[PDB]
């Protein structure tokens, strides 16, 4: 409620309660992470149908 650590100054600086003693937020559900970039194994999903597309009529 008084002090919270600072990344750049590397010192215990002043802060409010809401970021000192509850640095975790009040979000209901932990959302998923991002996609795995530069992955060795790739599994592409089939979108709709290839025979349904590619039609120039």
């Amino acid at each position: 409620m008084y002090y919270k650590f600072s990344s750049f100054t590397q010192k215990l600086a002043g802060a409010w309660a809401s970021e000192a003693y509850t640095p975790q937020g009040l979000k209901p559900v932990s959302x998923x992470x991002x996609x795995x970039x530069x992955x060795x194994x790739x599994x592409x999903x089939x979108x709709x149908x290839x025979x349904x597309x590619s039609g120039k009529n």
Binding site: X42, X44, X46, X47, X48, X50, X53, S54
Partner: protein, 98 residues
Amino acid sequence: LDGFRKWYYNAAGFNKLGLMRDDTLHETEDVKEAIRRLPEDLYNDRMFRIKRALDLTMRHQILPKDQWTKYEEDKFYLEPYLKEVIRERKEREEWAKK
């Protein structure tokens, strides 16, 4: 002509850099209008694939053979938007006719 179209698809060379046909078609005004009509995820995927294409062509390299896009899984994402924009342009043209 499934095999012949696959052979021409491989010989074109844009599957080697991980593009798509709708990725690599040239941007006219209708094409830019349909790109503006593309949704967020498809637009981001398109721009990343183009950026990787620029990077590979700069390095004079291509993707690995397993990472090449295949003829069976080449989605045509920009095509319905392009047809709708073409339809709108033709309708404006015939109203200018009348």
